[PDB]
Amino acid sequence: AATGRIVAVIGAVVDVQFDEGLPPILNALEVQGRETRLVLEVAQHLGESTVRTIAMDGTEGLVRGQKVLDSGAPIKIPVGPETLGRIMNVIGEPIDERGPIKTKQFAAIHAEAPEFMEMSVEQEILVTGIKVVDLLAPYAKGGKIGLFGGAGVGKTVLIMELINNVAKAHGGYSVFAGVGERTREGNDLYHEMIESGVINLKDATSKVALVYGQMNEPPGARARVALTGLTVAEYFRDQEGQDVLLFIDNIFRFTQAGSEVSALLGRIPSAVGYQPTLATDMGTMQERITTTKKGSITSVQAIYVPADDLTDPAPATTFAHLDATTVLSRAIAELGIYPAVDPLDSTSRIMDPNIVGSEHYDVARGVQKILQDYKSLQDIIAILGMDELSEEDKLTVSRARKIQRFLSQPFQVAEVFTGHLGKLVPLKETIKGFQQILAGEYDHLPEQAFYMVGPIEEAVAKADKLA
Amino acid sequence: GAATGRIVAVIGAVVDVQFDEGLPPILNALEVQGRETRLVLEVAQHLGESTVRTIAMDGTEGLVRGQKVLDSGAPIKIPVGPETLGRIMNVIGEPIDERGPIKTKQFAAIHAEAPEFMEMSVEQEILVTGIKVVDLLAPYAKGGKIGLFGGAGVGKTVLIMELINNVAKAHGGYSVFAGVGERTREGNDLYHEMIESGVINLKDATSKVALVYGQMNEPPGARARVALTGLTVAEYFRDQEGQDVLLFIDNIFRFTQAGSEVSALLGRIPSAVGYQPTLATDMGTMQERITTTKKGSITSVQAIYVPADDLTDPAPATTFAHLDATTVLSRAIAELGIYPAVDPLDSTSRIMDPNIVGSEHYDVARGVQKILQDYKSLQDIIAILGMDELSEEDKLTVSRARKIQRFLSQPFQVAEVFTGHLGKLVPLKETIKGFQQILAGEYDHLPEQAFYMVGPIEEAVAKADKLAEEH
Amino acid sequence: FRDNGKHALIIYDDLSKQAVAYRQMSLLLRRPPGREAYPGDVFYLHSRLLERAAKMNDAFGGGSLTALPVIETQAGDVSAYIPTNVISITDGQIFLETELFYKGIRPAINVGLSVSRVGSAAQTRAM
Amino acid sequence: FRDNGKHALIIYDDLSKQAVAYRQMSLLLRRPPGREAYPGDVFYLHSRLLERAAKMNDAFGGGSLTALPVIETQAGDVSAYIPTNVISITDGQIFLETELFYKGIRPAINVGLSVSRVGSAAQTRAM
Amino acid sequence: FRDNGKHALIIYDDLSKQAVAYRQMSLLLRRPPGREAYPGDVFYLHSRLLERAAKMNDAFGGGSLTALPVIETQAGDVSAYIPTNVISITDGQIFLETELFYKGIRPAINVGLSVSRVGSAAQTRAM
Amino acid sequence: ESTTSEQSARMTAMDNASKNASEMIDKLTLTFNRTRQAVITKELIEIISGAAAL
Numbered sequence A: 001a002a003t004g005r006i007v008a009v010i011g012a013v014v015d016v017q018f019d020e021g022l023p024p025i026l027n028a029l030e031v032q033g034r035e036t037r038l039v040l041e042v043a044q045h046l047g048e049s050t051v052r053t054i055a056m057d058g059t060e061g062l063v064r065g066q067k068v069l070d071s072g073a074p075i076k077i078p079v080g081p082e083t084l085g086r087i088m089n090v091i092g093e094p095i096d097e098r099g100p101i102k103t104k105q106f107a108a109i110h111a112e113a114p115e116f117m118e119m120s121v122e123q124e125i126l127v128t129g130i131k132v133v134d135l136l137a138p139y140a141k142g143g144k145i146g147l148f149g150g151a152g153v154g155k156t157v158l159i160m161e162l163i164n165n166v167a168k169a170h171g172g173y174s175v176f177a178g179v180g181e182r183t184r185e186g187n188d189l190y191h192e193m194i195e196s197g198v199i200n201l202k203d204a205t206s207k208v209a210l211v212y213g214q215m216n217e218p219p220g221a222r223a224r225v226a227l228t229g230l231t232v233a234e235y236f237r238d239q240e241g242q243d244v245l246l247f248i249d250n251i252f253r254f255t256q257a258g259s260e261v262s263a264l265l266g267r268i269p270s271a272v273g274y275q276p277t278l279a280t281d282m283g284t285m286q287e288r289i290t291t292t293k294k295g296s297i298t299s300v301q302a303i304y305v306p307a308d309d310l311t312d313p314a315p316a317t318t319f320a321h322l323d324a325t326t327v328l329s330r331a332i333a334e335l336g337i338y339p340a341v342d343p344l345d346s347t348s349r350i351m352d353p354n355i356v357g358s359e360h361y362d363v364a365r366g367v368q369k370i371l372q373d374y375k376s377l378q379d380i381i382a383i384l385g386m387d388e389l390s391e392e393d394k395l396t397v398s399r400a401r402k403i404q405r406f407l408s409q410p411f412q413v414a415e416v417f418t419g420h421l422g423k424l425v426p427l428k429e430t431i432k433g434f435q436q437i438l439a440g441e442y443d444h445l446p447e448q449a450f451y452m453v454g455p456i457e458e459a460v461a462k463a464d465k466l467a
Numbered sequence B: 001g002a003a004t005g006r007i008v009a010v011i012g013a014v015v016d017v018q019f020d021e022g023l024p025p026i027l028n029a030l031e032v033q034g035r036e037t038r039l040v041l042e043v044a045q046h047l048g049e050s051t052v053r054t055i056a057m058d059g060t061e062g063l064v065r066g067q068k069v070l071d072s073g074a075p076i077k078i079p080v081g082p083e084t085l086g087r088i089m090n091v092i093g094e095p096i097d098e099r100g101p102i103k104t105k106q107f108a109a110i111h112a113e114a115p116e117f118m119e120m121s122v123e124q125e126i127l128v129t130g131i132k133v134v135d136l137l138a139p140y141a142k143g144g145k146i147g148l149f150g151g152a153g154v155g156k157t158v159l160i161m162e163l164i165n166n167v168a169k170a171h172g173g174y175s176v177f178a179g180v181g182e183r184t185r186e187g188n189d190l191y192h193e194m195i196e197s198g199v200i201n202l203k204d205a206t207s208k209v210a211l212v213y214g215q216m217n218e219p220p221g222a223r224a225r226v227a228l229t230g231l232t233v234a235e236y237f238r239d240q241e242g243q244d245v246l247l248f249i250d251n252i253f254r255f256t257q258a259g260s261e262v263s264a265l266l267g268r269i270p271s272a273v274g275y276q277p278t279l280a281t282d283m284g285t286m287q288e289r290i291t292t293t294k295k296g297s298i299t300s301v302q303a304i305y306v307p308a309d310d311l312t313d314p315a316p317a318t319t320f321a322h323l324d325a326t327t328v329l330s331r332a333i334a335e336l337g338i339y340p341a342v343d344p345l346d347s348t349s350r351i352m353d354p355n356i357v358g359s360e361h362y363d364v365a366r367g368v369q370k371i372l373q374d375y376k377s378l379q380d381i382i383a384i385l386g387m388d389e390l391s392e393e394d395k396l397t398v399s400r401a402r403k404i405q406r407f408l409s410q411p412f413q414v415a416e417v418f419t420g421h422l423g424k425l426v427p428l429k430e431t432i433k434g435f436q437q438i439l440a441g442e443y444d445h446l447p448e449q450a451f452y453m454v455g456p457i458e459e460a461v462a463k464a465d466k467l468a469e470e471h
Numbered sequence C, D, E: 001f002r003d004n005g006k007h008a009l010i011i012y013d014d015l016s017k018q019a020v021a022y023r024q025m026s027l028l029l030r031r032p033p034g035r036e037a038y039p040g041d042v043f044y045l046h047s048r049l050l051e052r053a054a055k056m057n058d059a060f061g062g063g064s065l066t067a068l069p070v071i072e073t074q075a076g077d078v079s080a081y082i083p084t085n086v087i088s089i090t091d092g093q094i095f096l097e098t099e100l101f102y103k104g105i106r107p108a109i110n111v112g113l114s115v116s117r118v119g120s121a122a123q124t125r126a127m
Numbered sequence F: 001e002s003t004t005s006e007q008s009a010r011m012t013a014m015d016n017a018s019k020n021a022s023e024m025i026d027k028l029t030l031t032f033n034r035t036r037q038a039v040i041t042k043e044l045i046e047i048i049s050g051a052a053a054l
């Protein structure tokens, strides 16, 4: 759509003067006369047939006068069923060098939100299969999750176990979207995913579609990575009707990169230093993840809290959209419990009897109670002694020890390491097992036999075999 | 004369001139005509259509637009040589003491470049001044660089005028005192404290100091260039003559801080907390000309004001790298009467090294600092448990540590008008021996008031006998 | 007085109100603000004032000119911008507090902190 | 030395003076400031530099490059602007305190506030 | 419904998000900010909206309009900039505590800090 | 008798100096957090207004 000469290059900001075919805002340009593709996405209009745009690769070797075309659309990306098991950057090019992605139709990355009369009005609960997550902090469908806990906690093994559970009972594929990630750790993620079974370099038996925008790529191309990993995630909602997942790592580097684009243009900053459009920019990304009538998109996002400040402007704005939290802490790994989930500091907004029912509420409020007093009398038994607690306190020692080991589970994606078969438990098998420990029907079981089993019938089975 | 420009815009202390014929380069000098005093403007920017942006060195009253401006062809040219000794001089090199003119045969333009990598003397030495905190804990070096930190009212004009007494009279080489923006009262004492003490002689030619004085009643473009008139007289004595020099500057924070007073009037966007965006560049342009090359040596002592006792301020915290030796005076110590106020756990030198000062000097000063950091972990217990709850080993720590803290204090000779005591000057061999014995236990039987304000350890037992006789 | 022989004394009540009359007067002349929108040369504003307070020699007349600048501070914090710029021009200080005034010490002078370069110790002989 | 099957090691000393040298250059080119008057692209300075350190593989030569960047904080404040970019980029930090330096522990390493993200794979089988 | 003798009720949810979406509209046109980078007139935004809830007398119909605004606070600060622009407008408050809601008392209404300046004189005699 | 009671009231009155210190730092972390954020904003408006006044 016409030819426009360049007229200014300042940093990661290019300035393109068209003649007739003036493109709309959010239109992707393509510079001609270069080695690999340099795209430019139009962000303003300035008058005098001049636009201004944010570059998405290095801005070196650009001469004042180069001819740049117009695609007549936004950034269009390969969207298909043959994009799983592959890796691409923000503008669709493959970077695992396994061959070009041979696809039929393309899709632009900028759309609008679902309509007011396309929503769903009855809240439902997306079971994953994990024991702690299903019960004490359940996921919604269409909901948004927060994942707290850095490296050294048992984190990436949780991500791959989610993807090997969503495709064994639900049938919806996923997307990974690393936003500004490390290039050194994008390869240990790729090479662990190969040997675990989710990406397969031989056939049509993949589950994840990696979209890596990495840390040495300019700030204009770091904000747009969660949209390109959202655009892929809608073909398995719109055009196929499945229950998509979507991982963003992490939700702070999406926010931090928006403040760099907004300060290269010239906009005056907000409170503590962020951009003025901080809640709308998070709005137009987070509103495209809903449960429409065809299918849904779920999301799982890791959050970094700067300077231990839970009222900082970036995690304040992100908490306004969340429907859950998950906290991975260093201490629960020391006990030997996997995954390292803190069941007292992990929440869920739909924890309410009108949404989850009556049976599920009066168990996840009972097993939430028995682990609160044990943290209190983890001091009285630590100073005064052992036999000096009451005989009704020799049962809050048992039933707060038998339970916090049954929050452990042998995963399936780490199959060769543990040597044990990966077990799955449905949502009525989580509830049937936790009720019988507060009822004390299995009060005659040692606290080690409640370790790395599946249903309630296995812990009992495991105990019989011992000794 | 060349390029007789014309004035167009006097906004503050930043005059802009417009040249018809010949544009002068950056860093020159310009001479405003028709004034009974000498006003010198230095070029700093080139704007387009033959207008430059200068900075005045005096008052900008009476500047009518359309006024002629001459040009000299070089930066500011001061006098220099041997005949500049026992004199006080202006920023543009003029007399301010009413003794007549400076008759020298050599001028030095104040803008030179830092000597290269292949002109760097590498050797370290030691230097003994006489003070039991300098010589024990942060020792100097012959040719090193020495900075005196600390807030306002903690003892920096006293500690720098005591080292002028100690070192700069028993020295064969010369000295220069450059006053970069301080009280004009304090610039009248040191002119008269050294006429009676023989360092300045007003009739013959055997003086051993030179003075450069531009004080804090001066416009903030002239309080940025007396730091450079200093080390241009203090470089002719190192390079041209092959001598040894001492460099005394008080205060060097007024060089940085008077660059923030004309930053935005020049046309720059201001950086963090209000400083100019060229902080660590105009500073390091100057603090690399104060070095010892292989033609001579310079031992530089500079007082460094820390604003509002905030050491993490960007004007002091970018000066901690241009220096070999730091003596940091605190205020919570000088409130206890301890004088010199020098912090024991914050001063630091490079030559504190078991291969230059010896492995007996080193084992002492790493046990003084280790028993003073052992004190502070007990002071948080005393505030709750009280003194008579501690064990008998920890009581022995507090008593020696308070004996050491009082023994680090020493009566200077310039406190003979403030306190009425008499002055000490302790040699190094006694300093090591005295502190070695308090750590051992050979003075565990004395009161603490013996150790306050003495010299050698043999004077701290001649006081514990007078206290017991007058009991 | 001072340039003719006699002895003067001058009180500025106060000098935190000669600064906000410079901040306003020189913002409407379109001069770019510094810290707390104060101009670049508030230190040069107070310093070119407080250095005329001389004590001349006896071959000029010997006259003197004392000065007693008053400074109001907010919440008793002395590390502000305009306080610290004028602490370091004066020889000594008199720190007036509030908990001294209310406990009963009036005039409420902190005699611990009220340091003074004693002025060649011209207290007097009997005192 | 990385493209040819050899190994190397580079020590930036220190990376908190490149970031001030860039900031002087931006704010005279009138590029718009941000927090602490750093430009917007200053995470882009230390991200494209500290990602060239790689461990290549057998089909490219078998080279290496290791980088130790040095960063100076100001009174234990690891939450300023530049010390929070470069903690997010790199693979661990080694944290030295001046309290341990005077209590007799030299080299003055804090063990609690230090980490390496790779760790036990980058050690010999005996250590 | 007010001006025709009928009785209305309006509920906003919430007025702190109208103020972050007016701050954006005023930063982007480069208007000077204030406390927490809020514009100079974030009071007149909410006063001229909440002045319109009135009760008219019997000449003008006798109809009424009741307004219940909603503000969100950050970890319990009732001395922030926006919650003291609405507390000094409305005729009372209904404080809800985040401590009382987790303990179990729901609706977690703090009875010691919730008042009504005018609604005391209008309730039923049975109560 | 008076030695046991002097020790077990040196335990209980030290728990209540430790509970009363947890409530004083959590009220002082919050005041610190707001005062930290309000000086980042304060110095930044000094620069935004320092550029745009040129």
Ligand SMILES: Nc1ncnc2c1ncn2[C@@H]1O[C@H](COP(=O)(O)OP(=O)(O)O)[C@@H](O)[C@H]1O
Residues within 6 Å of the ligand: B151, B152, B153, B154, B155, B156, B157, B158, B159, B334, B339, B340, B341, B412, B414, B415, B418, B419, C116, C117, C118
């Ligand atoms: N021996 C001493 N040690 C410590 N302080 C002293 C001593 N003698 C006098 N003082 C007082 O300490 C103050 C230190 O101020 P001074 O060093 O003159 O200026 P600065 O503010 O630059 O430190 C002086 O006013 C003086 O009254």
Ligand SMILES: [Mg+2]
Residues within 6 Å of the ligand: B156, B157
């Ligand atoms: Mg002084």
